[PDB]
Write an enzyme that holds these catalytic residues in place. Structure first.
Site: not given
Ligand SMILES: *c1cc(-c2ncccc2C)n2ncc(C3CCCCC3)c2n1
Ligand SMILES: *c1cc(-c2ncccc2C)n2ncc(C3CCCCC3)c2n1
Lengths: 305, 305
Positions: B143, B145, B41
């Protein structure tokens, strides 16, 4: 987003752990620059433990009586000295993995990470608080002496604790890196009173703010209180009195959530008087006091090192 | 001696974290040998997030569109490929800090340490369990991820988890290091059901054994039960059914304490039916299910790495 008892990354400290042996005793040491720090009780034997005469025992030791091993690297001991309850062994090689570091004496209620070690090797890492009575509720077995507690600020490791002993009560006691015990403890095998412990009020409030930030808001009520009224309740439940300094330290969390510190105190007052009625806050059924206001902001803001 | 939620020392994993940027998106990557692993992603933008066509998006990318930085070391991307939900960027330099490692797909109920990172830099370390419904109750912000979960066995790091996303419910989802999600989750911005979670029974029993080892024995009662009678209670309280395999895994703790596994099940049955009556076990007012039987033995035996 979740809230966990998060420890500092331990890499910078792992590179400093060494094994120190003196006679039949082996424990952990901390190698920083050309000095290895370890508990002075490394020089006492089973017959001495009740009341060792550390000055006399150390006089019978020479540099070659201390064996220091950093992994498989054998260090050469060229000087030894006692500073309070720590032994400082001067070695002929500066640790190439020495991080930027400071030695600090932390205040009760402050937190730090512990890298538990055995035979100079890391076993695990966990976060803990210096209790108001200067004990630590750690997880330590025989051979864990010399394991250290620390905090990190960007690239600097502030070492604040070196494990010395378990008290008969199962709680832990140790010193700062200058060898001064936290609390009234002595390095001998005797029953020692730690005295009354209290709950760290400013930390409980910080954790209630962390709970509000994460969506756990059920405990927010329609009451307010005063610093003096709240302190009457704090004394009743063996909580530390809250001061204006503590209110000031909670300012950033109060600003982020829009909940006035005294309103959060009225919520805490109700939880103390009425209990939690089988409910949980951030996955806990007790009021948590091991997160400082700084810890909450670091975790909720994603501060890196 | 105390019992804490202990994480593995994170040093071996800290040396593998890098920052990966593709266009406007920056996240964490894991650099092992000459390959950097990160969530696919990283290639999707705000307009794509609802249902990205990863194959089409990746076709529009070339090696020079991926920027990889290990601290201040700029890595040169010489190949890219997608494996399930992970991107594998071949780099022209093998990581000199690569530990001995394996990639493993853990089972639900198993535990691991998470090194939470932002911008390729470590923020903290904590221990957590893969829930029976394949979510993790972590602590992660935007961030995070690409942050990984792992276990260590002496000198070998077994990577089991790479963080991908937070679900609208605040729980976390990710993949193994081959890019296969744990659970039914997909890498897109949609509401996704995690389904019914249950309590990890074998872990609760292991933690009751850890409690007995540490002197907390108030919950030991005069009853016994059968595996089938206990399983009727387990189904009622949303606990995983206990099997003979689980009883066998608890054998070492049963031997150390002299408490038969079915006798510990009768204690757990009483705690489930009657609650804890305002008492605590190992400092907790809830039944803890985040320690496996292996975790209890490692912590109570001081296993080093
Ligand atoms: C990376 C990190 C995170 C995340 N983790 C924990 C807490 C908040 C967040 C935003 N992500 N959450 C969702 C995603 C998505 C982005 C779009 C594609 C699918 C995954 C994300 N990425
Ligand atoms: C080193 C480690 C420990 C220890 N810590 C935690 C759990 C168990 C144990 C044994 N120590 N406890 C006591 C001591 C003593 C040894 C004699 C001199 C004073 C300190 C100790 N050392």
């Amino acid at each position: 987003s979740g809230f966990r008892k998060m420890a500092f990354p331990s890499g910078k400290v792992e590179g400093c752990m060494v094994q120190v042996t003196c006679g039949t005793t082996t424990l952990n040491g901390l190698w920083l620059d050309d000095v290895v720090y370890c508990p002075r009780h490394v020089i006492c034997t089973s017959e001495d433990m009740l009341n060792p005469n550390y000055e006399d025992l150390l006089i019978r030791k020479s540099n070659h009586n201390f064996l220091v091993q950093a992994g498989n690297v054998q260090l050469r001991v060229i000087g030894h000295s006692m500073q309070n309850c720590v032994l400082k062994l001067k070695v002929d090689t500066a640790n190439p993995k020495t991080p930027k570091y400071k030695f600090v004496r932390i205040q009760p209620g402050q937190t730090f990470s512990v890298l538990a070690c055995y035979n100079g090797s890391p076993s695990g890492v966990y976060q803990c608080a210096m209790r108001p009575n200067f004990t630590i509720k750690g997880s330590f077995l025989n051979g864990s002496c010399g394991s250290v507690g620390f905090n990190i600020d960007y690239d600097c490791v502030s070492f604040c604790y070196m494990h010395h002993m378990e008290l008969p009560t199962g709680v832990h006691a140790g010193t700062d890196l200058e060898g001064n015990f936290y609390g009234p403890f002595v390095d001998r095998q005797t029953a020692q009173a730690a005295g009354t412990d209290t709950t760290i009020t400013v930390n409980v409030l910080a954790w209630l703010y962390a709970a509000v930030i994460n969506g756990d808001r059920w405990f927010l009520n329609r009451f307010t209180t005063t610093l003096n009224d709240f302190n009457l309740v704090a004394m009743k439940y063996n909580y530390e009195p809250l001061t204006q300094d503590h209110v000031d330290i909670l300012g950033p969390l109060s600003a982020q959530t829009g909940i006035a510190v005294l309103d959060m105190c009225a919520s805490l007052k109700e939880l103390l008087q009425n209990g939690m009625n089988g409910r949980t806050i951030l996955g806990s059924a007790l009021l948590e006091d091991e997160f400082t206001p700084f810890d909450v902001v670091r975790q909720c803001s994603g501060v890196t090192f």
